[PDB]
Design a protein around this ligand. Structure first.
Ligand SMILES: *[C@@H]1O[C@H](CO)[C@@H](O)[C@H](O)[C@H]1NC(C)=O
Ligand SMILES: *[C@@H]1O[C@H](CO)[C@@H](O)[C@H](O)[C@H]1NC(C)=O
Ligand SMILES: *[C@@H]1O[C@H](CO)[C@@H](O)[C@H](O)[C@H]1NC(C)=O
Ligand SMILES: *[C@@H]1O[C@H](CO)[C@@H](O)[C@H](O)[C@H]1NC(C)=O
Ligand SMILES: *[C@@H]1O[C@H](CO)[C@@H](O)[C@H](O)[C@H]1NC(C)=O
Ligand SMILES: *[C@@H]1O[C@H](CO)[C@@H](O)[C@H](O)[C@H]1NC(C)=O
Ligand SMILES: *[C@@H]1O[C@H](CO)[C@@H](O)[C@H](O)[C@H]1NC(C)=O
Ligand SMILES: *[C@@H]1O[C@H](CO)[C@@H](O)[C@H](O)[C@H]1NC(C)=O
Ligand SMILES: *[C@@H]1O[C@H](CO)[C@@H](O)[C@H](O)[C@H]1NC(C)=O
Ligand SMILES: *[C@@H]1O[C@H](CO)[C@@H](O)[C@H](O)[C@H]1NC(C)=O
Lengths: 208, 342, 228
């Protein structure tokens, strides 16, 4: 009923944050901000009406069923997680985190087959590593014998590095030992701004 | 030319100066005689907007009824504000009479005559009157007693059916009697009787009307989720005694989905210690009067609350409501609004 | 000035019940409904229900029907929340709230301007489980003109946290320990990786050191190229 997009927003101070919420019914929509370790705060109600203490840098708009919260000139106190609300329903949230800008760096992609030690446990984990890239936005797709995988993967991303301002991401594909031995080619496809085309690292089970 | 406005209405009734009955006594000093030949002016080519949920007429009726009750139903002991007040509490004659609310000079009441009017929005057939119909100040929860019936179909009323915090008033087009009795010779125990055949047929009609408002979902009734006895039970005053009746059998989903046909009997209990509906505290009254206590009323409406939550099922749940007595007046004042001439 | 003061956080085991309070001040308590909203990290904020002080009228969210109870105390103007049959899914921060617009005659429930400071509630088993540590082997051929990646996978432990060092902390450059993820089994898992010169794979020994204090576990695992 309330589809908040996107998920994570990585911006520098001074930039503008654009957060949108698609609703299925019309009615009073509110926006809330939650700073780290603090209680949520009413930012906007009734679509565009600014709550008390809220600077004119925050503004709400609406086009069709799409409600948008725009935060111009980001300050330190603006970063956190934002939610839209309609009656008792809330959006998933939009995380707005601080990003320090640097030159584009493509990731280095490595892939690790399941350990022989783990294959003696009935489960198989394949790990794809995206090392030291910028900007943060990256897509990873698992393929098993040229079949798009879904619902059997989990990803993790590091904080922006305090020295080189890059990110690293780990994706893990988990299969049963039985299901893993059923297929040969295991591949992770990586799409990133620093890559002229999606890069695929892969291996064939059995052979070294 | 007129405009929506709010003014101090005056009351009219047919009270008897010789009656010792409480409402009659109040209305004698608070109201004026009624009009034998009322004047009503129908207005064609006129469309007006109405909103029963923002009608301030309700606010004034609320004050009067509070005043009436506070000056009549006096407790033996009053416990509010951490203090104790001991007064005299003699038994009284109690039976509500019809009350008309009227506008002074320069003000007129506009009346919606649309047979399917739901309480908000525009109305096509608007008439011009000085007074409302005779409204009985019946104070109750869950069920609306002794009120006016809907002209055509059963009408669902709500400021916003999307908002689960907004009360739903179901307005019936066919009344169903409820026969409550405290027999002579536990003196506090009582009961109410309802024709199960009539009731379940109406209740079936209620669910079908609700389906029209909720995308043909399965309509389910449930008992109240919690709160004071005044709302978890059907609460009302009969002959000066405070009744609390359990309505679990009234909303039997099995009978609206064989055997249910018959006479439904709700358990009741007359309480002497009640919560003061002035939103204050506890009042303590004397034991009930001896002999058979009885009142037969028309069920003319139902107060409901609809369940909410981030769920995903094709069935809505409704529970007997109440608490805010201002809704009782809204259900009778919905077709009225005050305008100021120029 | 409207204020809502909640009681202190608490820890619970699965199966227990919890009660938390919200003391209100600064306004006419009986005029406005009180809501309870819980927030868990990674999840949508969840409305639990509302309670109207005047008669204690309540409305509970469908998915919590039967487990939740809301009451109030008029004298102390305090709202109370009870949640029974607790599980992991109930781990969250619990807030009481009240709408912006409230008069003696009217209100709007859902524009939540007023929040309590929040009451964190953790619900977990007292049981602990040590990690499994699997090697993430570099490669098979050595390239004398590039860098190699390696690490260990730290799988199926409970609860948080685990720490990973390399060569007893003597190797820090190019090390990346990722945030743990919660698996479907309810058990955590993370990866720790490090990039090293490929020309040192036949010379230097790389050992990841995994620590899991809750289970009193310390595991060292040597990560080396596979033999084939
Ligand atoms: C219903 O509620 C919405 C806000 O949720 C409001 O904009 C609208 O005017 C309401 N409708 C009526 C008929 O009162
Ligand atoms: C308004 O008057 C018309 C015309 O006589 C009549 O048909 C109708 O019953 C009235 N409107 C409603 C909604 O009942
Ligand atoms: C009860 O309803 C009947 C018809 O349903 C009506 O004749 C009677 O006057 C009503 N009693 C009231 C309104 O007190
Ligand atoms: C009352 O309204 C219902 C529709 O909600 C209808 O089926 C029924 O015939 C009506 N009863 C009357 C007009 O007596
Ligand atoms: C009443 O009718 C109006 C017509 O404008 C509509 O907007 C409103 O939703 C209706 N209310 C109910 C409770 O059906
Ligand atoms: C109400 O019920 C009593 C028994 O409890 C019965 O004697 C009486 O006739 C009933 N009254 C009516 C009007 O049906
Ligand atoms: C219930 O009402 C029906 C009419 O709707 C009537 O025929 C029947 O006798 C009543 N049942 C009892 C037990 O009074
Ligand atoms: C109402 O009566 C039913 C009888 O089945 C009982 O289960 C329920 O607990 C009662 N509720 C209250 C609030 O007394
Ligand atoms: C509901 O109605 C059926 C049919 O008579 C009956 O057997 C059942 O016990 C009733 N239960 C309640 C809660 O009224
Ligand atoms: C409803 O009106 C009848 C008389 O028409 C009366 O006997 C009964 O007590 C009234 N009910 C209530 C709850 O006032």
């Amino acid at each position: 009923v309330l589809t908040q997009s996107p998920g994570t927003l990585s911006l520098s101070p001074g930039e503008t944050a654009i957060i949108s919420c698609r609703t299925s019914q019309y009615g009073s929509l509110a926006w809330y901000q939650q700073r780290p370790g603090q209680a949520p705060r009413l930012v906007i109600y009734s679509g565009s009406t600014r709550a008390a203490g809220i600077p004119d840098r925050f503004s709400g708009s609406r086009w069709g069923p799409d409600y948008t919260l725009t935060i111009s000139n980001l300050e330190s106190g603006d970063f956190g997680v934002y939610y839209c609300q309609q009656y008792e329903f809330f959006g998933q949230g939009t995380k707005v985190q601080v990003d320090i800008k640097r030159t584009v760096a493509a990731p280095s992609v490595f892939i690790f087959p399941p350990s022989d030690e783990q294959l003696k446990s009935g489960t198989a984990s394949v790990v794809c590593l995206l090392n030291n890239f910028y900007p943060r936005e990256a897509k990873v797709q698992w393929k098993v014998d040229n079949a798009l995988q879904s619902g059997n993967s989990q990803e993790s991303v590091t904080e922006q590095d305090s020295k080189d301002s890059t990110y690293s991401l780990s994706s893990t594909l988990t299969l049963s030992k039985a299901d893993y031995e059923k297929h040969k080619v295991y591949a992770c496809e990586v799409t990133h701004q620093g890559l002229s085309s999606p890069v695929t690292k892969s291996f064939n089970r059995g052979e070294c | 030319v007129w405009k929506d406005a709010d003014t101090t209405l005056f009351c009219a009734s047919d009270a008897k100066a010789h009656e010792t009955e409480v409402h009659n006594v109040w209305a004698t000093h608070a109201c004026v005689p009624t009009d034998p030949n009322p004047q009503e002016i129908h207005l064609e080519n006129v469309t007006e907007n109405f909103n029963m949920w923002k009608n301030n007429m309700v606010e004034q009726m609320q004050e009067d009824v509070i005043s009436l009750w506070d000056q009549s139903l006096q407790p033996c002991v009053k416990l509010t504000g951490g203090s104790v007040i001991k007064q005299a509490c003699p038994k009284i004659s109690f039976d509500p009479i019809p009350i008309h609310y009227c506008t002074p000079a320069g003000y007129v009441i506009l009346k919606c005559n649309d047979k399917n009017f739901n309480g908000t929005g525009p109305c096509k057939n608007v008439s011009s009157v000085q007074c409302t119909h005779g409204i009985k100040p019946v104070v109750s929860t869950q069920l609306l007693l002794n009120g006016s019936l809907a002209e055509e179909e059963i009408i669902i009323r709500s400021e916003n059916l999307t908002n689960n915090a907004k009360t739903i008033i179901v307005h019936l087009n066919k009344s169903v009697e409820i026969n409550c009795t405290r027999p002579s010779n536990d003196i506090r125990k009582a009961y109410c009787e309802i024709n199960g055949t009539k009731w379940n047929k109406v209740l079936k009609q209620v669910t079908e009307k609700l389906k029209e408002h909720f995308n043909n979902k399965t309509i389910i009734f449930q008992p109240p989720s919690g709160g004071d006895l005044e709302i978890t039970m059907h609460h009302f005053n009969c002959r000066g005694e405070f009744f609390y009746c359990n309505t679990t059998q009234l909303f039997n989903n099995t009978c609206i989905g064989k055997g249910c046909n018959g006479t439904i009997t709700l358990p009741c209990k007359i309480k002497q210690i009640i919560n003061m509906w002035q939103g204050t505290g506890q009042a303590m009254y004397a034991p009930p009067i001896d002999g058979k206590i009885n009142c037969v009323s028309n069920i003319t409406g139902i107060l409901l609350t609809r369940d909410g939550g981030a769920n995903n099922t094709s069935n809505e749940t409704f529970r007997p409501g109440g608490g805010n007595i201002k809704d009782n007046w809204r259900s009778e004042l919905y077709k009225y609004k005050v305008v100021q001439i120029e | 000035q409207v204020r809502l003061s909640q009681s202190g956080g608490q820890m619970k085991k699965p199966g227990d019940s919890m009660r938390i309070s919200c003391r209100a001040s600064g306004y006419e308590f009986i005029n406005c409904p009180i809501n309870w909203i819980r927030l868990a990290p990674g999840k949508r904020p969840e409305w639990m229900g509302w309670m109207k002080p005047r008669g204690g009228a309540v409305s509970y969210a469908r998915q919590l029907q039967g487990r939740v109870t809301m009451t109030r105390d008029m004298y102390s103007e305090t709202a109370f929340l009870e949640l029974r049959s607790l599980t992991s899914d109930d781990t969250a921060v619990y807030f009481c709230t009240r709408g912006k617009y409230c008069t003696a005659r009217d209100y709007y429930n859902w524009d939540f301007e007023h929040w309590g400071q929040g009451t964190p509630v953790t619900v977990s088993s007292a049981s602990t489980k040590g990690p499994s540590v699997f090697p993430l082997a570099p490669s098979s051929k050595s390239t004398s003109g590039g860098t190699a990646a390696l690490g260990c996978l730290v799988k199926d432990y409970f609860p948080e946290p685990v720490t990973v060092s390399w060569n007893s902390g003597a190797l820090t450059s190019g090390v990346h320990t990722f945030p743990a993820v919660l698996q479907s089994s309810g058990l955590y898992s993370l990866s720790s990786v490090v990039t090293v010169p490929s020309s040192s794979l036949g010379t230097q020994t790389y050992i990841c050191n995994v620590n899991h204090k809750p289970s009193n576990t310390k595991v060292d695992k040597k990560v080396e190229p596979k033999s084939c």
